[PDB]
């Protein structure tokens, strides 16, 4: 039964320089469109009408300050389709109204779906287990919670991250000032997962490189490996003794080691994702109530927690009017929180 | 049973197939973006975060002498000379909130020079 | 008194901190980069007020 | 009649240590927030 | 400090229930030949 479906299946799964597959039909346009979209925007498109910001090379921004900014708060959670009721088919207006943001975020979402389907597809064709895809669930959780769920909980897309370096920095500082996000134990678990991940990456890599068997004569040890060799290229036993004596414990199981390297950063990212889903509702880990009761009553009680709250209050008061222009915050100098002299 | 029992500590033979992994990841991207040499791969695993964290540390250590981050505050100006804000300027607003509130009683003079 | 302005910051569990808010607080700004071992203090109470433990640690 | 699907269950000592460390560290982390 | 007093039991159970779980699993593993 070699019908057109099967012929097409043949063509899609040819062993070429860039594998296509069925997933490729979703993955390649969407990814391409997201990338192009970010490149177009950051090169040419302003954020004047949505944020009161220049954001393109064309306006004089550099690589750090360009962005594809979110739509105006007034757009709400509009899909902002080009042919939708806001832009009404007008490409130029669409760009000025922030259409590229939903364009990039949505094509990006479907692109990510495509990539993970690609991981599954290739895994199935080659005969390996699909742990790479499974691992990729974590970036998808992050992307979806931060760029979609979080603004969906808020008033509008406006408060989603904007796609740019400095724009993202602003996102960080906003989360500190408004959400006290560093205090959030889900973020903390994320930080543990990412730094623990980096740590495992370094330590596994270094350990392997420093327990190599001499399998060649050259001072460059890289040559003394063959992809099809059956023997391990480094000594697990020596590695184990070294770490047991340096640090107390060591891996002894290689499968467990590499699984653990999968497990740590994936789980961390998933945890941070959960926390951000909380922040979508302003369900924050903002305060410790006991601390606040004590500090309210006792003007000599000070901790790093109360200190940081003073910092957050500063961040809010000083950045809100420019960061949220649609609110029309007018804060007279006299109401701005300031310490002595500064 | 746990797959981990398939590996026994000290066994001479590799517990996974690096050719299969390479075939997979190489098709994921393209062939020449995948490692086929475990040594050079593991070396990459070592080098990337180590070099990166070296740079982070050097960042802290050089900002210790007040060679600070890029400043594009009011870098973009229109034809008349109006400041056109960028995201850099928003960041500056947040930074100002931090600066003015931090150690609220410790400064007597207008510049916080250390 | 981390910042040396006679405004002591509470860092320990027994003094109203939890795991998240607690700290060993940096030594006093009045000390600057001066070396402050225990024996440079007139008493342990002084040493503690001025944040000697941070330096030792 | 004895069900043929029964399987023994295992938890080795290393898994016990790992698990205990996870539970205890999670408790050390969340306890502040439980007390609030 | 006016902490939430339930914190105590919440923490205690948080530690004891899963820990005990593990301990049961471990001990009956050891008692197998």
């Amino acid at each position: 039964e070699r019908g057109w479906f099967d012929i097409l299946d043949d063509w899609l799964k040819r062993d070429r320089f860039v594998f296509v597959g069925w997933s490729g039909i979703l993955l390649f346009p969407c990814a391409y469109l997201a990338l192009g979209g970010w490149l177009t925007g950051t090169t040419f498109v302003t954020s004047w009408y949505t944020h009161g910001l220049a954001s393109s090379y064309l306006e004089g921004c550099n690589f750090l300050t360009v962005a594809v900014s979110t739509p105006a708060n007034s757009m709400g959670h509009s899909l902002l389709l080009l042919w939708g009721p806001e832009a009404q088919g007008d490409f130029t207006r669409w760009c000025q109204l922030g259409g590229l943001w939903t364009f990039i975020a949505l094509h990006g979402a479907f692109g990510l779906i495509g990539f993970m389907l690609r991981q599954f597809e290739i895994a199935r064709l080659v005969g390996v287990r699909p742990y790479n895809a499974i691992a990729f669930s974590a970036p998808i959780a992050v992307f979806v919670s931060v760029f979609l769920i979080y603004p969906l909980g808020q008033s509008s897309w406006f408060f989603a991250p904007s796609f740019g370096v400095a724009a993202i920095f602003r996102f960080l500082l906003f989360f500190q000032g408004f959400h006290n996000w560093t205090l959030n134990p889900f973020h903390m678990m994320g930080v543990a997962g990412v730094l623990g991940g980096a740590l495992l990456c370094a330590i596994h890599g270094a350990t392997v490189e420093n327990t190599l068997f001499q399998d060649g004569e050259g001072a460059s040890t890289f040559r003394a490996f063959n992809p099809t060799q059956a023997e391990e290229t480094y000594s697990m036993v020596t590695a184990n003794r070294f770490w047991s004596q340096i640090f107390g414990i060591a891996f002894s199981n290689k499968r467990w080691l590499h699984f653990f390297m999968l497990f740590v950063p994936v789980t961390g990212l998933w945890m941070s994702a959960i926390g951000v889903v909380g922040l979508a509702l302003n369900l924050r880990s903002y305060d410790f109530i006991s601390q606040e009761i004590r500090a309210a009553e006792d003007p000599e009680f000070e901790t790093f927690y109360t200190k940081n709250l003073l910092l957050n209050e500063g961040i809010r008061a000083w950045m809100a009017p420019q960061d949220q222009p649609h609110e029309n915050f007018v804060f007279p100098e006299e109401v701005l929180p300031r310490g002595n002299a500064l | 049973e746990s797959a981990n029992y398939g590996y026994k500590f000290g066994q001479e033979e590799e517990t996974y197939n690096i050719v299969a992994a390479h075939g997979y990841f190489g098709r994921l991207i393209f062939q020449y973006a995948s490692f086929n040499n475990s040594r050079s791969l593991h070396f990459f695993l070592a080098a990337w975060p180590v070099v990166g964290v070296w740079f982070a540390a050097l960042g802290i250590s050089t900002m210790a002498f007040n060679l600070n981050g890029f400043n594009f505050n009011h870098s973009v100006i229109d034809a008349k000379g109006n400041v056109i804000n960028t995201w850099a300027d928003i960041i500056n607003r947040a930074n100002l909130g931090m600066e003015v509130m931090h150690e609220r009683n410790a400064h007597n003079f207008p510049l916080d020079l250390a | 008194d981390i910042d040396g302005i006679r405004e002591p910051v509470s860092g320990s569990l027994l003094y109203g901190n939890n795991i998240i808010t607690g700290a060993v607080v940096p030594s006093s700004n009045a000390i600057g980069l001066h070396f402050y071992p225990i024996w440079e203090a007139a008493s342990l109470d002084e040493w503690l007020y001025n944040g000697g433990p941070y330096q030792l640690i | 009649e004895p069900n043929p699907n029964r399987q023994p269950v295992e938890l080795n000592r290393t898994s016990l240590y790992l698990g205990l460390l996870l539970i205890l560290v999670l408790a050390l982390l969340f306890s502040s927030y439980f007390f609030n | 400090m006016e902490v939430n007093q339930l914190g105590l039991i919440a923490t205690a159970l948080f530690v004891l229930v899963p820990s005990v779980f593990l301990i049961i699993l471990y001990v009956q593993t050891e008692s197998q030949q």
């Binding site: - | 500590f9 | - | 000592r13 460390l21 050390l28 306890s31 | 923490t11």
Partner: peptide
């Protein structure tokens, strides 16, 4: 109460270090 709790958990973790290090499953070469 909180303090006792915090220090208790901490103390358990240190005890756990002791056992995981000195009363570990020995790695055995095969």
């Amino acid at each position: 109460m909180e303090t006792i709790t915090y220090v208790f958990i901490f103390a358990c973790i240190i005890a756990l270090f002791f056992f995981a290090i000195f009363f570990r499953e020995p790695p055995r070469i095969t």
